[PDB]
Design an enzyme around this catalytic site. Structure first.
Site, PDB file in Angstrom:
ATOM      1  N   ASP B  25       0.806  -1.182   0.000  1.00 47.78           N
ATOM      2  CA  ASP B  25       0.000   0.000   0.000  1.00 47.78           C
ATOM      3  C   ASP B  25       0.873   1.280   0.000  1.00 47.78           C
ATOM      4  O   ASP B  25       1.348   1.736   1.066  1.00 47.78           O
ATOM      5  CB  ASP B  25      -0.923   0.056   1.211  1.00 47.78           C
ATOM      6  CG  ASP B  25      -1.901   1.192   1.231  1.00 47.78           C
ATOM      7  OD1 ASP B  25      -1.888   2.044   0.359  1.00 47.78           O
ATOM      8  OD2 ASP B  25      -2.732   1.218   2.166  1.00 47.78           O
ATOM      9  N   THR B  26       1.039   1.873  -1.188  1.00 49.73           N
ATOM     10  CA  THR B  26       1.765   3.152  -1.287  1.00 49.73           C
ATOM     11  C   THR B  26       1.097   4.325  -0.604  1.00 49.73           C
ATOM     12  O   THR B  26       1.828   5.336  -0.319  1.00 49.73           O
ATOM     13  CB  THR B  26       2.114   3.468  -2.745  1.00 49.73           C
ATOM     14  OG1 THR B  26       0.903   3.627  -3.475  1.00 49.73           O
ATOM     15  CG2 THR B  26       2.936   2.376  -3.364  1.00 49.73           C
ATOM     16  N   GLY B  27      -0.205   4.166  -0.229  1.00 50.96           N
ATOM     17  CA  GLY B  27      -0.899   5.248   0.463  1.00 50.96           C
ATOM     18  C   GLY B  27      -0.850   5.033   1.968  1.00 50.96           C
ATOM     19  O   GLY B  27      -1.488   5.773   2.682  1.00 50.96           O
TER      20      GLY B  27
HETATM   21  C1  LIG Z   1      -6.906   8.562   3.078  1.00 50.90           C
HETATM   22  C2  LIG Z   1      -5.455   8.651   3.501  1.00 50.90           C
HETATM   23  C3  LIG Z   1      -4.582   7.638   2.982  1.00 50.90           C
HETATM   24  C4  LIG Z   1      -5.117   6.421   2.284  1.00 50.90           C
HETATM   25  C5  LIG Z   1      -5.070   5.171   3.097  1.00 50.90           C
HETATM   26  C6  LIG Z   1      -5.509   4.022   2.200  1.00 50.90           C
HETATM   27  N1  LIG Z   1      -5.406   2.688   2.759  1.00 50.90           N
HETATM   28  C7  LIG Z   1      -6.289   1.631   2.236  1.00 50.90           C
HETATM   29  C8  LIG Z   1      -6.260   0.510   3.185  1.00 50.90           C
HETATM   30  C9  LIG Z   1      -6.734  -0.770   2.547  1.00 50.90           C
HETATM   31  C10 LIG Z   1      -7.773  -1.264   3.451  1.00 50.90           C
HETATM   32  C11 LIG Z   1      -7.183  -1.500   4.832  1.00 50.90           C
HETATM   33  C12 LIG Z   1      -7.645   2.088   1.935  1.00 50.90           C
HETATM   34  O1  LIG Z   1      -8.516   2.750   2.642  1.00 50.90           O
HETATM   35  N2  LIG Z   1      -8.121   1.719   0.891  1.00 50.90           N
HETATM   36  C13 LIG Z   1      -9.532   1.985   0.541  1.00 50.90           C
HETATM   37  C14 LIG Z   1      -9.761   3.396  -0.066  1.00 50.90           C
HETATM   38  C15 LIG Z   1     -11.166   3.703  -0.518  1.00 50.90           C
HETATM   39  C16 LIG Z   1     -11.474   3.207  -1.859  1.00 50.90           C
HETATM   40  N3  LIG Z   1     -12.770   3.148  -2.161  1.00 50.90           N
HETATM   41  O2  LIG Z   1     -10.689   2.830  -2.601  1.00 50.90           O
HETATM   42  C17 LIG Z   1     -10.223   0.784  -0.155  1.00 50.90           C
HETATM   43  O3  LIG Z   1      -9.713   0.142  -1.255  1.00 50.90           O
HETATM   44  N4  LIG Z   1     -11.414   0.478   0.051  1.00 50.90           N
HETATM   45  C18 LIG Z   1     -12.198  -0.552  -0.810  1.00 50.90           C
HETATM   46  C19 LIG Z   1     -12.262  -1.674   0.158  1.00 50.90           C
HETATM   47  C20 LIG Z   1     -11.014  -2.472   0.279  1.00 50.90           C
HETATM   48  C21 LIG Z   1     -11.641  -3.618   0.962  1.00 50.90           C
HETATM   49  N5  LIG Z   1     -10.453  -4.491   1.280  1.00 50.90           N
HETATM   50  C22 LIG Z   1     -10.415  -5.548   2.086  1.00 50.90           C
HETATM   51  N6  LIG Z   1     -11.456  -5.960   2.792  1.00 50.90           N
HETATM   52  N7  LIG Z   1      -9.257  -6.213   2.199  1.00 50.90           N
HETATM   53  C23 LIG Z   1     -13.544  -0.055  -1.115  1.00 50.90           C
HETATM   54  N8  LIG Z   1     -14.299  -0.282  -2.244  1.00 50.90           N
HETATM   55  O4  LIG Z   1     -14.027   0.747  -0.313  1.00 50.90           O
HETATM   56  N9  LIG Z   1      -3.968   5.063   4.032  1.00 50.90           N
HETATM   57  C24 LIG Z   1      -4.242   4.859   5.102  1.00 50.90           C
HETATM   58  O5  LIG Z   1      -5.483   4.634   5.335  1.00 50.90           O
HETATM   59  C25 LIG Z   1      -3.071   4.943   6.026  1.00 50.90           C
HETATM   60  N10 LIG Z   1      -2.862   6.085   6.860  1.00 50.90           N
HETATM   61  C26 LIG Z   1      -1.877   6.780   6.829  1.00 50.90           C
HETATM   62  O6  LIG Z   1      -0.995   6.354   6.006  1.00 50.90           O
HETATM   63  C27 LIG Z   1      -1.840   8.067   7.701  1.00 50.90           C
HETATM   64  N11 LIG Z   1      -0.783   7.985   8.590  1.00 50.90           N
HETATM   65  C28 LIG Z   1      -1.009   7.518   9.850  1.00 50.90           C
HETATM   66  C29 LIG Z   1       0.279   7.601  10.580  1.00 50.90           C
HETATM   67  O7  LIG Z   1      -2.046   7.017  10.312  1.00 50.90           O
HETATM   68  C30 LIG Z   1      -1.810   9.406   6.847  1.00 50.90           C
HETATM   69  C31 LIG Z   1      -3.044   9.358   6.022  1.00 50.90           C
HETATM   70  O8  LIG Z   1      -1.932  10.609   7.625  1.00 50.90           O
HETATM   71  C32 LIG Z   1      -3.094   3.734   6.959  1.00 50.90           C
HETATM   72  C33 LIG Z   1      -3.128   2.470   6.231  1.00 50.90           C
HETATM   73  C34 LIG Z   1      -2.236   3.695   8.255  1.00 50.90           C
HETATM   74  C35 LIG Z   1      -0.693   3.817   8.013  1.00 50.90           C
END
Ligand SMILES: CCCC[C@@H](CN[C@@H](CCCC)C(=O)N[C@@H](CCC(N)=O)C(=O)N[C@@H](CCCNC(N)=[NH2+])C(N)=O)NC(=O)[C@@H](NC(=O)[C@@H](NC(C)=O)[C@@H](C)O)[C@@H](C)CC
Lengths: 99, 99
Positions: B25-27
């Site tokens: 995860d690059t994000g």
């Molecule tokens: C918004 C800010 C940054 C984006 C985010 C994306 N991470 C992924 C995590 C993957 C799931 C755990 C994410 O939400 N992905 C979503 C984004 C929304 C989207 N629609 O794409 C996703 O694909 N969601 C799919 C669901 C994935 C379901 N996956 C599964 N069940 N395995 C969906 N359709 O909603 N990063 C984070 O959420 C990270 N946070 C950070 O990196 C923060 N830093 C700190 C220190 O907390 C910074 C933002 O300030 C996390 C991981 C902690 C280090």
């Protein structure tokens, strides 16, 4: 480009004639922006991340430019801590993760 | 490898003598796993994502293997919908995003 990951991988995008920044997020299925309004009709969509879920607007067939790639894709509009470009648009750039 | 992004970019990792899967995860600034217990002392840490914040355990100087790369890094343990490998560990793999 070849982007290194010691920093957050932020790019300039152009959407609805406006320049924005967003985070290239391989862990995002979809593209979510907060700081633009898009025109026309949409459907409710639920997205999920690390905090829980959020309701957003799903706008379809949106035109968007990212480096100089003119692609059309679903863009979700709603709350997010950072604009993010997900795999739905990164596929269209032919982006890969390499190591 | 070169990893394409039409699918979620999931890898095998080895942590605490156990095999798990996780999303590159690059994000993600940090690395978060939910389906392992780590030994020894930790510190409270808040992380933030789409949807809001979550309280996790911060474990430091954890050894972890991702594709024959034996790195030490901070691992957070807590709730997350997916195990994820963040930029803290991806930098140590020399991983880049290319397009
Ligand atoms: C918004 C800010 C940054 C984006 C985010 C994306 N991470 C992924 C995590 C993957 C799931 C755990 C994410 O939400 N992905 C979503 C984004 C929304 C989207 N629609 O794409 C996703 O694909 N969601 C799919 C669901 C994935 C379901 N996956 C599964 N069940 N395995 C969906 N359709 O909603 N990063 C984070 O959420 C990270 N946070 C950070 O990196 C923060 N830093 C700190 C220190 O907390 C910074 C933002 O300030 C996390 C991981 C902690 C280090």
């Amino acid at each position: 480009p070849q982007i290194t990951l010691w920093q957050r991988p932020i790019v300039t995008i152009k959407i609805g004639g406006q320049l924005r920044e967003a985070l290239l997020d391989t862990g995002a299925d979809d593209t979510v922006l907060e700081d633009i309004d898009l025109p026309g009709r949409w459907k409710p969509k639920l997205i999920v991340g690390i905090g829980g879920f959020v309701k957003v607007r799903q706008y379809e067939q949106v035109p968007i430019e990212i480096a100089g790639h003119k692609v059309v894709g679903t863009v979700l509009i709603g709350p997010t801590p950072s604009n993010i470009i997900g795999r739905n648009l990164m596929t269209q750039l032919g982006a890969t993760l390499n190591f």
